[PDB]
Design a protein around this nucleic acid. Sequence first.
RNA 1: GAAACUCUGAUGGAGGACCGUACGGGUUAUUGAUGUGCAAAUCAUUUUUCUGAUGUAGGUAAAGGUGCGAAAGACUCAUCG
RNA 2: AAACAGAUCCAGAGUUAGUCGAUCCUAAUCUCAAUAAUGGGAGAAAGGGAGUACAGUUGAUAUUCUGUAACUGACAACAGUUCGCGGCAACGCAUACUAUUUUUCUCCGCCAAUCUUAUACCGUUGGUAGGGAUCUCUUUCCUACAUGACAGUACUAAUACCCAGGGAAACUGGUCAUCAGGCGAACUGCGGCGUUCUGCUGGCAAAACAUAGCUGUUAUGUCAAUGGCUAUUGGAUUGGUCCAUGAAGCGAAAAAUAGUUUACUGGUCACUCGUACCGAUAACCGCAUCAGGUCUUCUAGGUAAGUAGCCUAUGGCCAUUGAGGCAUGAUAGUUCAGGGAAUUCGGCCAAUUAGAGCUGUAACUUCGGGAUAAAGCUUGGCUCUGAUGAAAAUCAGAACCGA
Lengths: 50, 97, 68
Amino acid sequence: AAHKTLRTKRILCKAMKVNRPMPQFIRQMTGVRHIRNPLTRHWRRRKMNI
Amino acid sequence: SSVFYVDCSAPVADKFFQLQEFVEYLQSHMKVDNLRKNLANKVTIEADAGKIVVNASVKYSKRAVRYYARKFLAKKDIRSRFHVIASGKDTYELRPY
Amino acid sequence: PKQVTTPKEFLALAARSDAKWVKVKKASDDNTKFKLRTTKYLYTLSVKPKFVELVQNSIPESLEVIVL
RNA sequence: GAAACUCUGAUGGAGGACCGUACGGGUUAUUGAUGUGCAAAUCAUUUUUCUGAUGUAGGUAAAGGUGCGAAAGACUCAUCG
RNA sequence: AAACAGAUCCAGAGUUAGUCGAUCCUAAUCUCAAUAAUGGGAGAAAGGGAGUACAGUUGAUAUUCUGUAACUGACAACAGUUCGCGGCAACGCAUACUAUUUUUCUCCGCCAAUCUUAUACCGUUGGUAGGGAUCUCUUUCCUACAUGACAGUACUAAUACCCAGGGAAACUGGUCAUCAGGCGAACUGCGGCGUUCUGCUGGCAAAACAUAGCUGUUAUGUCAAUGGCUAUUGGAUUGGUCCAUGAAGCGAAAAAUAGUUUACUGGUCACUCGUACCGAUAACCGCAUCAGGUCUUCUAGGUAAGUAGCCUAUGGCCAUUGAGGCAUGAUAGUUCAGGGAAUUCGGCCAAUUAGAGCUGUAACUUCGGGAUAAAGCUUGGCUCUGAUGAAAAUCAGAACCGA
């Protein structure tokens, strides 16, 4: 960046909208506990390698 | 062949000052050819009516009159009360704030 | 933005059915500038205060005139 | 000065010339500091080079009994007889 | 360490283009196809490459948005002009299209010198606006004094090259330097032409900025003169160097030879994708907010030979746990009577030397070097004098002064 391609930009979009906390209502629905979002990361710690 | 004015109505009534002190200051502090007390047809200094009439035959700056005006205000401890600013061309004025 | 010397040539440029407005504007030395707008260019006309009064009358009636 | 030419001063700006800068390229010495490091090779002072057989970037070529090597068995992703 | 802070956590929000890039062309190089062929395609966000500037605005976007002013290309009809002339010449001025061939622009190494716009900086001359300073002194000190792309046509004056006349040894003209000339020099033309230059405008004060006053806007003002021995950048005029001679292609224009001919000037639209921020100083690579490493850009004043070291405006900052002690020791530093390598494997280390100007320089030598050889001296401050330049600079000389 800048000067990213479009299909590069498509991946970086999907990588940041997927990065969030898990919703509250799944724990209320299924009753499971201790499920983490796997595709959470931090930009500084883990690099994507894409 | 210039002439300059410095308007003092606001300063005279409110505090100290007085024209005979201010003219006597500018008699023996203003200087021409880098020398004090040499004013034989160089300038003349005056008052009239209820200003200061600085009448220069020799080439003489308006900004000289600013310098010796502002030096007087620090001497009397009337800094932070009035200050010298231009009303119009060939005039200064000592307004408050 | 070109300048135009002759007052006669200005009035040829005014009556083209290109021009959207003329702007009257006071200037230094007691002159004034008639700035004819065209689609491409902006034709200016410097004039003295002798022939200032006549030129405004000369301008076409239809064209809008914005004073400044 | 008979001549062939050769004395003085200026002009000129050649050279893998010289001194010397850097967030440049190298890495000599103190066998200094560090050695439970800032660092799986660093830091300080000193030292070498600085229009060139120069440095450097991107793209591109060469692949494991091969490659590449101003040659140390060097280097080929902290790995190399 | 602490924390209400944070590049942390949580919730929302943000990247606007016909002109900047990609897209298009080829380079090193790679890959298919045909041989009835003589190629096609890929390959550069530093090469080539048509075209944009200012001012304003947001909590984050701007050459992208808004305002204002340009410019380039493609596709349409339509209105008005026009059916080739000037100069002895260099050349000027209003003229088509298809094809073939030929040529040019695009277009090119490195180094050195001279001249000159723009920008920065320092200057002599003044000035006016505001602010800082004041026991005394300082007509002082600081800030400000500005105009974009784009379009025009004056005469000043340049150098390159060409043209007309001119017709050169008693050789003349010319550069910082080499040099130029009967294959036509000096020299004259209010020559020709290209590139730079000065002035005057348009853009343009309506904007922007600084003061003063009123509750959003009204006032004045942004001025006049003229140097750079300083630097960087663009350009011009040249030289030197090589057993080194320093891209291609798309594209564009021109010319010639055929053939077909009337031409020129003056509404609409411009697709696609990138655009935030960091760029090491905590945002990249080193497992990490690692004293490491990694390409480039704009580059102020003083001291000085300086893009050194040292100090300071603009800009950015206090990155760094605190409170109290100070013996010993480790480490980085100044200094040490007398001696001066006796220390030690070893002058390792540190000390001495040093810049500049004026003297003065040996053996040996491949005659170029050695050489800054070695070895001596002088250097401040203040008041002056003189020489060389255009020049506000630089060089030489003399007084007087005290640790």
